[PDB]
């Protein structure tokens, strides 16, 4: 059922999901206070094609840390999702930062038992992914390009603005709106009656400093995706702890200035 | 409820809906054997703007004939639909051959008690109209242009072909298909599980001879819309009776040759 | 079967098929010596939409003359073809000079018992029509435009040239050729092994004088389609007799000069 | 005859065809459990023009392993196909990843005694190759470019979708469909009556991990083409065994997770 | 006279013309069994402008080998042709792989006593060169670019196809055909009455393996031009002998497999 999957997915509200690559980085992200760790197999990506992490690394990370352990599957690759569901991962991320498997179609996420996290860039994609069965949505910026926050905040603002426009729209115009954004009408009506999309919204792309995570959490999101670019700094633990405390206390400026 | 409206609408299956313009033409179309008469107020349209017929003409036609009496409302004009529903017309036709009131939006046909007939040109428009609340769909060709049947048969073939493609599509591709035709996914799944759209399909545009009505009924439609271009011939009663008998016996070529 | 239909169709070889419009014109074209008479219902076409002739006119013409009586059906309109087959017409002409019913698809001429005549403009269309089931092919020029012979002779030359190229082509290139002209490969191989398309080829469009019919019969065709533009001259019988004698004696220049 | 060639070709159903380059790699691919080994002569391709492998290498590979030994011939180069048929190779691959010999035409595969494997990218090319005489078809993605699976799964989805559309199409539209995809009509009707193309379908291009082979076998294919990019890894035998076991057990997720 | 020049030129039928660059390579190509050796002066071309070989090298090669010794002259450079005719070379090659002297005009090959070999890319160029006086024609592919055979086989197929089309064309269309290919009409009529162009046709460009030479000789050519890219391999004598035996036995697949 979709209700129980949303219930399992909404325990990550108000936390930071850290991208780890080994048992040591997983233990570090757990000790920092991350809500979950998403696994990437390589230490470095030498400009090649990326794919689902190797299963023994996922088993090691899952045995080491006690926080939920996500995993990445190429978009449209349902066999990788089946393999991940067999490994009993807590959440499966139908990720588009990894090389795309199927450009046209996506994974029919209703056949699986594990909750899914899908990326979006506007309300149309978010509602389409929720219709396909995604139990959690992440607003995506720009990965593999830089550490800038422009595209992420732009997409978050776009999504929140479209949802606020929907929440006050006339009932006669909801159909034309759903046609304009190419979204299923039932989910559009649910977003109109609820005020938010009926899933958990995280942010991704460019979040490096505590200020960026606090900004993402002040725009209305529920959490941040902290990539692996933090573990190559001078002290990864301090950065991770500061980001986590920023997500937890996004309203207090003194705590933010202390973590920064 | 939508179920009872579809039930009231599906009594027109296997009949011809004749466009009448007066009490005499209404009585003629009733004596010919039409399943219903759709009302157009003027005797002639002098290149002006057309709109909903005048209520006393609808009352006269409804008092004269005992067959269902439809009425036309400009697309997007919900006040004309309210006025028609107040007159207790059996069916309301959200017609696009009459001048368009609202180009962007349509009528929220869920607020009304009378069944609605909406025009379409492909499966996307048909499913959108069924989602808005249309209890009956007519595949439209080209009105106010000529008496040709090309556009009507083209649209009927397109709709039936899209429905046949849906009926056999892979379950993973139904989402991308619904996005491609911009239709609500629940109605797309209903059309896939049912084999036809879950309403009554009529044809319109260019049906003049019995051969055209039999062709429209052999492509899979459920009835024809016979315009007012039949009453300006030498003998309208013979043409109407031949069209009705053609719709009733679309499979027998001898009856068709006798009516022609 | 297709063999018996080709057998019934190939009795028109070396004759002129005259377009008649009434019992008197049919008797005139029979007394002139036409091999068959193709029926057109109106005396004049007032710039409207044309369609299959009215059945009582076909019955009258068929009762009057003893030569084969053709009939015209709109391309893609199979119900008109069913009605014509019910009237026991000798040949059915899936004509494109009459307004087109179905622009995309044609008639599945395998379901009918009467031989079909289909129009073409190159070898690709000819082979496609023979594959659909056309028992006779007419190379078409330009109707409803003028009385010029340019397009007709151009199309006849194109078809005969493509067939002559096929007859000598290398066996390895026949597949690429069939792909280039978009024709079924079995019919392409049959045309290569036979030297002509495996049907009877007539010409149509602009044939007015005996010289034009003799030219069409000297390019390799098997007959001509003489339209109704001959009956509006000063003496239709003399023109028809001259055209028939020209088709019969296309090789003798003295007979041609006498008929002209 | 084509029937016996399809019979000899359909013994490869449910297996992986490994691209080997020497006697040692051939023995390795045989010990892994490959259904057949396709031969490529060089150890490396230094950005030059590739062609049919040198005959003594084919003789050595054929003497070493007992599994079927394929061979590659440039598309349009029938003399290389004659040389390969003289060497008594089990299957000849009219390959397009090797430099093209004849851009316009292909090999007339009816003159040869050995079964042929032809590449395709849609149903039109597949049916054209089956008409030319190809006893086996491989859906091709992108070679010599990367190790991505996007183009391969896109082409497989396109072909299976076109075949599913054909299987349910109206009988009157099959002719226009065959014209649209430019395929011989007899093979189109055979695909419509059979539900699949009347040959064995393999996949090629980018298959590296067991998940990719299981995905290709879950989309409806009958086998995979595992290129030579597996023998340059740390342990080629483990990768080959995992791919073979994935093709054999494409439905079991636990076996897939164990092989991965 | 042109007849005696064609007679002297047609002794090369069924042989390979090898491009040599020194006395040793000339002796090697003679011992391999080449029908003639075409002389190129340099050991390497360092991206400069090439021209007629130096006369003492031609004299040395002509004194060493007993097979005919060709020579290259820039297209449009008649003084180089005069110098070559003075050296009593057996054949003069008006070559376009060497830098072009005159882009617009060619050599008036009627003023010379030695037979000429001219390059072509279609039947128009072939007939124009035969009209200018070329006693032998070579169908050219792509030199100085790669070792691919695509352009050569494309041009050979184009020329043979145009000649086969001519051989069966209607007599009234030969004039328009000659205008379309811009060829002298007398030579077009000679090609129509003869079935081939009235000269000896060789192939050039990309012929490296015995399979390529056998393919060129199976398409209808009379010989191959084996460039100097064979003498920079590990064993030039084996390659040359295999190419010669392939040209001699282009119909036997066992001999071809033995030479390959």
UniProtKB/Swiss-Prot annotation, chains A, B, C, D, E:
Its main location: cytoplasm. The protein has no function in the formation of pyridoxal 5'-phosphate. It comes from Arabidopsis thaliana (Mouse-ear cress). The keyword Ion transport does not apply. The lineage of its organism: Eukaryota, Viridiplantae, Streptophyta, Embryophyta, Tracheophyta. Keywords: Acetylation, Cytoplasm, Pyridoxal phosphate. Homodimer or heterodimer with PDX1.1 or PDX1.3. No interaction with PDX2. One of its GO terms (cellular component) is cytosol. GO terms for molecular function: protein heterodimerization activity. It is found in: Cytoplasm. GO terms for biological process: pyridoxal phosphate biosynthetic process. Belongs to the PdxS/SNZ family. It comes from the Eukaryota. This is Pyridoxal 5'-phosphate synthase-like subunit PDX1.2. Expressed in callus tissues, flowers and roots. Weakly expressed in leaves and stems. Disulfide bonds: none annotated. The gene is PDX12. The keyword DNA-binding does not apply. Unlike PDX1.1 or PDX1.3, PDX1.2 is unable to interact with PDX2 and restore prototrophy in yeast snz1 mutants.
